[PDB]
Design an enzyme around this catalytic site. Sequence first.
Site, PDB file in Angstrom:
ATOM      1  N   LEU A  31      24.556  -2.139  21.149  1.00 14.06           N
ATOM      2  CA  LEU A  31      24.781  -2.909  22.369  1.00 14.06           C
ATOM      3  C   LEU A  31      23.536  -2.866  23.253  1.00 14.06           C
ATOM      4  O   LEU A  31      22.845  -1.842  23.304  1.00 14.06           O
ATOM      5  CB  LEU A  31      25.973  -2.351  23.135  1.00 14.06           C
ATOM      6  CG  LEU A  31      27.262  -2.220  22.334  1.00 14.06           C
ATOM      7  CD1 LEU A  31      28.263  -1.406  23.141  1.00 14.06           C
ATOM      8  CD2 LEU A  31      27.843  -3.587  21.956  1.00 14.06           C
ATOM      9  N   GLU A  53      35.505  -1.079  28.328  1.00 13.69           N
ATOM     10  CA  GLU A  53      35.260  -2.332  27.625  1.00 13.69           C
ATOM     11  C   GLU A  53      35.589  -2.183  26.143  1.00 13.69           C
ATOM     12  O   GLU A  53      36.240  -3.047  25.555  1.00 13.69           O
ATOM     13  CB  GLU A  53      33.807  -2.770  27.830  1.00 13.69           C
ATOM     14  CG  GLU A  53      33.582  -4.284  27.873  1.00 13.69           C
ATOM     15  CD  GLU A  53      33.736  -4.972  26.523  1.00 13.69           C
ATOM     16  OE1 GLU A  53      33.112  -4.529  25.531  1.00 13.69           O
ATOM     17  OE2 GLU A  53      34.486  -5.977  26.447  1.00 13.69           O
TER      18      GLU A  53
HETATM   19  N1  LIG Z   1      28.421  -7.363  22.302  1.00 19.60           N
HETATM   20  C1  LIG Z   1      29.320  -7.731  21.312  1.00 19.60           C
HETATM   21  O1  LIG Z   1      30.372  -8.256  21.655  1.00 19.60           O
HETATM   22  C2  LIG Z   1      28.923  -7.576  19.914  1.00 19.60           C
HETATM   23  C3  LIG Z   1      27.770  -6.886  19.640  1.00 19.60           C
HETATM   24  N2  LIG Z   1      27.317  -6.801  18.338  1.00 19.60           N
HETATM   25  C4  LIG Z   1      25.856  -6.554  18.095  1.00 19.60           C
HETATM   26  O2  LIG Z   1      25.300  -7.853  17.862  1.00 19.60           O
HETATM   27  C5  LIG Z   1      24.336  -7.814  16.797  1.00 19.60           C
HETATM   28  C6  LIG Z   1      24.771  -8.648  15.584  1.00 19.60           C
HETATM   29  O3  LIG Z   1      23.609  -9.138  14.998  1.00 19.60           O
HETATM   30  P1  LIG Z   1      24.011 -10.402  13.867  1.00 19.60           P
HETATM   31  O4  LIG Z   1      22.633 -10.592  13.282  1.00 19.60           O
HETATM   32  O5  LIG Z   1      24.648 -11.411  14.741  1.00 19.60           O
HETATM   33  O6  LIG Z   1      25.024  -9.555  12.946  1.00 19.60           O
HETATM   34  P2  LIG Z   1      26.069 -10.304  11.888  1.00 19.60           P
HETATM   35  O7  LIG Z   1      27.316  -9.487  12.078  1.00 19.60           O
HETATM   36  O8  LIG Z   1      26.099 -11.764  12.118  1.00 19.60           O
HETATM   37  O9  LIG Z   1      25.505  -9.919  10.366  1.00 19.60           O
HETATM   38  C7  LIG Z   1      24.861 -11.063   9.822  1.00 19.60           C
HETATM   39  C8  LIG Z   1      24.959 -10.922   8.288  1.00 19.60           C
HETATM   40  O10 LIG Z   1      26.311 -11.075   7.925  1.00 19.60           O
HETATM   41  C9  LIG Z   1      26.380 -11.989   6.822  1.00 19.60           C
HETATM   42  N3  LIG Z   1      26.959 -13.224   7.303  1.00 19.60           N
HETATM   43  C10 LIG Z   1      26.991 -13.722   8.609  1.00 19.60           C
HETATM   44  N4  LIG Z   1      27.642 -14.888   8.710  1.00 19.60           N
HETATM   45  C11 LIG Z   1      28.074 -15.142   7.417  1.00 19.60           C
HETATM   46  C12 LIG Z   1      28.800 -16.201   6.871  1.00 19.60           C
HETATM   47  N5  LIG Z   1      29.234 -17.233   7.691  1.00 19.60           N
HETATM   48  N6  LIG Z   1      29.100 -16.238   5.545  1.00 19.60           N
HETATM   49  C13 LIG Z   1      28.647 -15.172   4.807  1.00 19.60           C
HETATM   50  N7  LIG Z   1      27.928 -14.096   5.174  1.00 19.60           N
HETATM   51  C14 LIG Z   1      27.649 -14.113   6.519  1.00 19.60           C
HETATM   52  C15 LIG Z   1      24.966 -12.119   6.219  1.00 19.60           C
HETATM   53  O11 LIG Z   1      24.873 -11.053   5.422  1.00 19.60           O
HETATM   54  P3  LIG Z   1      24.013 -11.260   3.871  1.00 19.60           P
HETATM   55  O12 LIG Z   1      22.545 -11.352   4.296  1.00 19.60           O
HETATM   56  O13 LIG Z   1      24.477  -9.956   3.269  1.00 19.60           O
HETATM   57  O14 LIG Z   1      24.661 -12.509   3.366  1.00 19.60           O
HETATM   58  C16 LIG Z   1      24.136 -11.993   7.518  1.00 19.60           C
HETATM   59  O15 LIG Z   1      22.907 -11.482   7.175  1.00 19.60           O
HETATM   60  C17 LIG Z   1      24.202  -6.338  16.390  1.00 19.60           C
HETATM   61  O16 LIG Z   1      23.181  -5.777  17.211  1.00 19.60           O
HETATM   62  C18 LIG Z   1      25.557  -5.756  16.775  1.00 19.60           C
HETATM   63  O17 LIG Z   1      25.427  -4.416  17.107  1.00 19.60           O
HETATM   64  C19 LIG Z   1      28.162  -7.159  17.259  1.00 19.60           C
HETATM   65  C20 LIG Z   1      29.296  -7.838  17.454  1.00 19.60           C
HETATM   66  C21 LIG Z   1      29.771  -8.203  18.816  1.00 19.60           C
HETATM   67  C1  LIG Z   2      32.816  -2.876  22.506  1.00 19.17           C
HETATM   68  C2  LIG Z   2      31.961  -4.099  22.157  1.00 19.17           C
HETATM   69  C3  LIG Z   2      32.688  -5.448  22.034  1.00 19.17           C
HETATM   70  N1  LIG Z   2      33.299  -5.964  23.077  1.00 19.17           N
HETATM   71  C4  LIG Z   2      33.917  -7.123  23.008  1.00 19.17           C
HETATM   72  N2  LIG Z   2      34.568  -7.606  24.207  1.00 19.17           N
HETATM   73  N3  LIG Z   2      33.950  -7.847  21.897  1.00 19.17           N
HETATM   74  C5  LIG Z   2      33.358  -7.399  20.807  1.00 19.17           C
HETATM   75  N4  LIG Z   2      33.397  -8.173  19.575  1.00 19.17           N
HETATM   76  C6  LIG Z   2      32.706  -6.176  20.841  1.00 19.17           C
HETATM   77  O1  LIG Z   2      32.075  -5.702  19.682  1.00 19.17           O
HETATM   78  C7  LIG Z   2      32.925  -5.034  18.781  1.00 19.17           C
HETATM   79  C8  LIG Z   2      32.215  -4.931  17.426  1.00 19.17           C
HETATM   80  C9  LIG Z   2      30.814  -4.346  17.586  1.00 19.17           C
HETATM   81  O2  LIG Z   2      30.932  -2.953  17.693  1.00 19.17           O
HETATM   82  C10 LIG Z   2      29.777  -2.277  18.101  1.00 19.17           C
HETATM   83  C11 LIG Z   2      28.579  -2.958  18.259  1.00 19.17           C
HETATM   84  C12 LIG Z   2      27.436  -2.292  18.659  1.00 19.17           C
HETATM   85  C13 LIG Z   2      27.498  -0.939  18.896  1.00 19.17           C
HETATM   86  C14 LIG Z   2      28.688  -0.259  18.733  1.00 19.17           C
HETATM   87  C15 LIG Z   2      29.844  -0.923  18.354  1.00 19.17           C
HETATM   88  C16 LIG Z   2      31.159  -0.166  18.116  1.00 19.17           C
HETATM   89  C17 LIG Z   2      31.628   0.859  18.815  1.00 19.17           C
HETATM   90  C18 LIG Z   2      31.064   1.491  20.022  1.00 19.17           C
HETATM   91  C19 LIG Z   2      32.243   2.207  20.647  1.00 19.17           C
HETATM   92  O3  LIG Z   2      33.088   2.581  19.501  1.00 19.17           O
HETATM   93  C20 LIG Z   2      32.912   1.606  18.506  1.00 19.17           C
HETATM   94  O4  LIG Z   2      33.643   1.421  17.588  1.00 19.17           O
END
Ligand SMILES: NC(=O)C1=CN([C@@H]2O[C@H](COP(=O)(O)OP(=O)(O)OC[C@H]3O[C@@H](n4cnc5c(N)ncnc54)[C@H](OP(=O)(O)O)[C@@H]3O)[C@@H](O)[C@H]2O)C=CC1
Ligand SMILES: CCc1nc(N)nc(N)c1OCCCOc1ccccc1/C=C1\CCOC1=O
Length: 186
Positions: free
Chosen positions: A22, A30
């Site tokens: 994050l 959150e």
């Molecule tokens: N703040 C939040 O709410 C969230 C935070 N995060 C953070 O956000 C960042 C995510 O980076 P991101 O690059 O977006 O990570 P992704 O979860 O999108 O991983 C991307 C990989 O997943 C696979 N992939 C993605 N889309 C598809 C698809 N449609 N079909 C098939 N395979 C697919 C591919 O893997 P391959 O190359 O193996 O095909 C691609 O390389 C991380 O830093 C994570 O920690 C994550 C989720 C939510």
């Molecule tokens: C709480 C964040 C969040 N928030 C909302 N609203 N939507 C989401 N899709 C989301 O991401 C959940 C999947 C991604 O998860 C992580 C990504 C980066 C770093 C850590 C985690 C997982 C953690 C940290 C705390 O414990 C866990 O399991």
Amino acid sequence: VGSLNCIVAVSQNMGIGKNGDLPWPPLRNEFRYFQRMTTTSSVEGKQNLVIMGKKTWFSIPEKNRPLKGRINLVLSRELKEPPQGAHFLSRSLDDALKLTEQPELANKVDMVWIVGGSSVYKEAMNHPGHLKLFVTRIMQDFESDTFFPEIDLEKYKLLPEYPGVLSDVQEEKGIKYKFEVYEKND
Ligand SMILES: NC(=O)C1=CN([C@@H]2O[C@H](COP(=O)(O)OP(=O)(O)OC[C@H]3O[C@@H](n4cnc5c(N)ncnc54)[C@H](OP(=O)(O)O)[C@@H]3O)[C@@H](O)[C@H]2O)C=CC1
Ligand SMILES: CCc1nc(N)nc(N)c1OCCCOc1ccccc1/C=C1\CCOC1=O
């Protein structure tokens, strides 16, 4: 199978991640909000399904892998089997959704939650149909290397309140944030 939903926490500059983490320090409540919204299922005898990309899966600490009480599906074209602790693997979002309608899952899945990352969000959001976005607005700029896609407000209506979602401003570790729900149907 019930509704299709995205859930995300995003900073003012649209950041969701940096180096697999994050952009902001841990916000415990959150995370509890994310756990509650994706796990809670009204339909008796079913679980929600969470869909995530591969990098999102490996961002979750092993302690919380798989996300408990939910069916965990990981998207990847390089992997040959679900990662350790995951339940399913699909090569496209279309394949994932089609899988929910197969007999293997037909009557086990209530709600479907896309929990990241950017490419999965983008495709779901820009695909016609009925979709909700549960968006936590982190109200500060944070350095990020991964960003949430644009929300087209012509399509996505910000709902004025939503059951189970706090409407007031939250604050953890000096960081203010708020919960929002958007809905499209096209
Ligand atoms: N703040 C939040 O709410 C969230 C935070 N995060 C953070 O956000 C960042 C995510 O980076 P991101 O690059 O977006 O990570 P992704 O979860 O999108 O991983 C991307 C990989 O997943 C696979 N992939 C993605 N889309 C598809 C698809 N449609 N079909 C098939 N395979 C697919 C591919 O893997 P391959 O190359 O193996 O095909 C691609 O390389 C991380 O830093 C994570 O920690 C994550 C989720 C939510
Ligand atoms: C709480 C964040 C969040 N928030 C909302 N609203 N939507 C989401 N899709 C989301 O991401 C959940 C999947 C991604 O998860 C992580 C990504 C980066 C770093 C850590 C985690 C997982 C953690 C940290 C705390 O414990 C866990 O399991």
